[PDB]
Amino acid sequence: LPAVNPWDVLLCVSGTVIAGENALVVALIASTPALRTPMFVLVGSLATADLLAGLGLILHFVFQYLVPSETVSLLTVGFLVASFAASVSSLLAITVDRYLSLYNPLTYYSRRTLLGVHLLLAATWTVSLGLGLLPVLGWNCLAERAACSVVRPLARSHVALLSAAFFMVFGIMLHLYVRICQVVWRHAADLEDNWETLNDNLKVIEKADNAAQVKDALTKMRAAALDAQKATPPHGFDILVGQIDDALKLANEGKVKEAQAAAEQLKTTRNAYIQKYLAHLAATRKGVRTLAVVLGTFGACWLPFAIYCVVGSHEDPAVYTYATLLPATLNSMINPIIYAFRNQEIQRALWLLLDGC
Ligand SMILES: CC(=O)N1CCc2nc(N3CCC(Oc4ccc(F)cc4F)CC3)c(N[C@@H]3CCOC3)nc2C1
C-alpha cells in the first residue's frame, strides 16, 4: 500500500480507466447532434482534458519503467500539466456558459454564443498546451540552481505559480456560481410577483361595472405575461398572450360581460402555463446543482495537491504525494460518472448503444 511501485501500477490501471471513459464521452458529444449545444460541447472539452490526464499518466508509467529517454517523461509531465489546466479552464467555461444561458437567454443568441463557445475551446486548449510545453522549453527543475517539486521534473516555482493561479481561478468560479444562483433567485421572484399581480387583476376584473376597469386589468395582465416571457425562452404561452389580446379586443368595443367571460376562459390556459414553467425551473435547479457538485468534487480532489506541491518539504514521505494525487487523479475518473447519473439527456445516449447491441 505505502509502496510507490504498487501505487504506480494502481494509478496506471486507474488512468487507463480514466482515458477510456473520457474518450467514450468525447465520442458521444462529437457524434450526438443533441449533445452539440454549447454546454455539452464544453463538457466534451472537459472530457478531452480528463482523457489527456489518463493518457499522460499511462504514458508516464509506460516510460517510467522501460522509458527510452527522460525528455519523453518531461513531455508527459507536460501532458499532465495540460490536462489539469484544460480541466480547470473548461470548468470555468461551463460555469460561464451556464451563467450566460440563464442571465438573459434571449441575449443567448446563436451568433455570440457559438462564437464564444468555439473561442473558449480555442483559448483553453491553446493555453493549456502551451503550459504543458513550457517545461519542454526549459521551464523544468533539472538545473543546479532550480529546486524540484514533488512532481518531477516540475520546479517548485512553476508548480507554485500553477497552484496560486488555480486557487484564484477556483475563487472566481465560486463567485460566478453565486451570481448564477442570484440570477435564478430573481427569475423565480419576478415570476412570483407576476403571479400575484395576474391573480389580483383577474380578481379585480370580476368586481367592476365599468368597461375601463377591464381594459386596465387586461393591459396589466398583458404586461405581466410579457415580462414572464422575457425571463426565459428556455411549450408556448404566446397563446395566452393571444387570448389576452382577444379579451382586450372584446373589452375595447363595449363588450364587458363577454370580456369578463374571456378573462375567465383564460383560467384554463393560465393553469397549463403555470404548470409548465415549474418544470423548467426544476430543470434549471437540477443543472445548476450538477454544476455545484462538480465544482465541489474538483476542489476537494485537487486542493490537497494544490497545497502540498507548495508546502511540500522535499524530505517528506512519498505517501503524501499519492494521498494528494489519488484524489486529484481519480477526480478525472469520477467526473464522467456524475453527469451520467444526473444529466438525463446524455444518460440517454449512454444506454442507447445497448439498443444498438
Ligand atoms: C512521478 C509521477 O508519479 N508522475 C509524473 C508527474 C506527474 N505530474 C502530475 N501533475 C503535473 C501537473 C500538476 O499541476 C498542478 C496541480 C496543482 C497545483 F497547485 C499546481 C500544479 F502545477 C499536477 C500534478 C500528475 N498528476 C496527474 C494528473 C491526473 O491525475 C494525476 N501525475 C504525475 C505522475
Swiss-Prot record:
One of the protein's GO biological processes: adenylate cyclase-activating G protein-coupled receptor signaling pathway
Membrane-side (Extracellular) residue stretches: 63-74, 138-162, 315-319
Topology feature Cytoplasmic, residues: 27-38, 97-117
Domain of life: Eukaryota
One annotated GO molecular function: G protein-coupled receptor activity
Subcellular location: Cell membrane
One of the record's GO cellular component terms: cytoplasm
Keywords: Cell membrane, G-protein coupled receptor, Glycoprotein, Lipoprotein, Membrane, Palmitate, Phosphoprotein, Receptor, Transducer, Transmembrane, Transmembrane helix
Topology within the bilayer: Multi-pass membrane protein
S-palmitoyl cysteine lipid attachment residues: D355
Record-annotated membrane-spanning stretches: 7-26, 39-62, 75-96, 118-137, 163-181, 288-314, 320-341
Protein family per UniProt: Belongs to the G-protein coupled receptor 1 family.
Reported function: Orphan receptor with constitutive G(s) signaling activity that activate cyclic AMP. Promotes neurite outgrowth and blocks myelin inhibition in neurons.
Record's protein name: G-protein coupled receptor 6
Primary gene name: GPR6
Span within the parent record: 69 to 347 of 362
